[PDB]
């Protein structure tokens with residue numbers, strides 16, 4: 129009954145499609161509406177909706193253009209919007225202390241960390257996240273007397289790993305030397321001898337001293353399929369063989385579920401690994417001034433900064449098995465193993 | 467240096483291979499050893515090791531035959547075993563109140579649930595699990611004013627779903643009628659009208675009233691790739707279209723990570739869905755007398771029953787996207803879409 133049925137959703141979804149190439153579903157819109165029922169704060173709406181930020185903005189713009197939301201007092205539904213949610217039955221969106229010494233020691237050290245710099249795309253997690261990560265990895269048996277490779281470390285996970293006393297050895301690669309220098313200084317104050325800084329071109333083949341030498345890697349790659357395949361491809365190639373662990377963050381803030389599907393296909397068909405854990409909002413990022421640089425910032429006439437750490441990622445854990453593989457050499461443009 | 471290096475692990479792993487066809491890795495053994503360092507209770511060793519029960523038993527038998535463990539006082543390392551773990555550097559394995567009305571009401575109802583029967587392969591989760599599941603599904607936006615299909619319900623999730631008041635409607639299929647009768651009686655005492663019992667042959671094509679009619683399905687399938695492809699294939703076919711949710715349990719107790727890899731490949735390449743959540747030990751099963759029916763029971767001369775709920779599964783959440791698909795018709799022997 130196309131003649132009498134509500135054409136509201138379809139109308140909204142078609143308008144969203146003129147604003148973004150991210151796949152738009154009716155539920156993308158419902159997710160945002162559900163978030164708006166819970167909160168008039170745009171950062172929280174993005175958080176609660178678990179849709180990528182540019183899709184949320186495009187959805188909020190479309191709903192505004194069509195009379196469903198106003199930005200005059202945070203983000204709120206109009207009466208037309210209140211009628212929309214009622215019609216479609218859209219509900220309001222509902223949502224470490226044993227290692228307390230580690231956390232105190234970690235905060236003590238990183239209070240003087242080098243300033244995050246836009247030049248190095250530096251966004252890092254809270255001290256509570258870092259320490260929870262260590263605990264989590266320990267509960268999976270991936271730390272104690274193990275060899276850890278930390279690919280990029282603006283989170284300063286290597287410091288928390290050293291403070292734990294658990295790993296046999298740790299190797300860290302980071303493009304920002306202020307970090308590696310700080311890590312080495314920290315290692316000295318901690319008395320942790322078995323720290324190495326790797327400095328090599330990630331574009332070029334892995335060197336023998338990083339090829340198949342680690343039990344566990346951890347990394348937090350940029351949010352593109354191309355960067356993930358490079359960072360995880362390279363991390364897996366640093367792993368000794370079967371039954372080694374990889375840890376990395378993937379966000380709903382910047383990657384759609386269609387993009388997640390491609391990532392997971394990469395993992396299983398390209399790298400032929402298994403996913404043991406996908407833990408929602410495990411990673412909480414310290415506000416670094418990212419909000420003000422987004423389109424969301426321009427959306428609400430009165431500017432308001434995030435009240436809390438709205439930017440979060442899921443923790444993925446992967447494990448190698450017989451036949452797993454990474455990229456030892458040149459990183460390819462397309463899938464080569466699949 | 468094959469001539470002087472410890473041949474201990476390789477020896478153990480070769481002996482394990484004569485006892486099981488489950489893929490055996492050196493880390494399978496390390497995982498068990500790490501668990502034995504934590505606990506002399508076989509149920510807890512299985513739990514902590516996160517290896518499948520028959521592999522754990524085969525590993526413990528092999529370690530015993532080779533002088534590394536004794537079963538004379540729970541499971542303990544011998545001096546030779548203590549030397550083995552020291553040599554390989556194996557560490558000891560380390561490891562709802564806002565809805566309190568729901569939980570009280572749920573316990574009140576299910577205290578008189580029908581007795582679990584071996585005839586129907588009935589093993590169910592704790593009341594705390596069931597209620598946590600409802601909360602979890604609600605936090606992902608999959609319950610409120612939604613249509614839920616419960617494929618098999620020895621957990622009595624439908625009762626907790628009804629007590630929540632959240633779903634538009636609920637449909638339940640279960641081979642044990644004592645359950646469906648109880649669910650209908652419960653519905654009446656709760657005042658929940660929108661419950662339907664489905665009774666159809668799952669082997670045969672889905673009927674029109676269950677084909678593409680639901681927003682969310684939940685199921686707890688048997689632990690074989692063949693049963694998972696049948697239960698999830700069928701659940702996905704009950705889903706309306708894109709952006710619908712499926713929930714199901716997968717255990718480390720009975721499926722190896724190599725089996726997980728096949729399952730995840732099924733999900734992404736057969737059904738072309740995305741995995742949004744893999745939550746370790748989310749499901750806690752009530753001890754149903756399964757332990758006494760296992761080989762583990764025969765392993766320790768003095769018989770001891772589990773002290774706690776040692777049998778746990780991970781919660782998987784999947785979401786359909788454009789191009790997802792299930793099995794509407796005959797369930798195939800092999801992959802048909804991949």
Ligand SMILES: [Ca+2]
Pocket residue numbers: 249250251252282283348
């Ligand atoms: Ca970072």
Ligand SMILES: [Ca+2]
Pocket residue numbers: 273274554555
């Ligand atoms: Ca080792």
Ligand SMILES: [Ca+2]
Pocket residue numbers: 587588589590620621686
């Ligand atoms: Ca069951």
Ligand SMILES: [Ca+2]
Pocket residue numbers: 216217611612
């Ligand atoms: Ca709906």
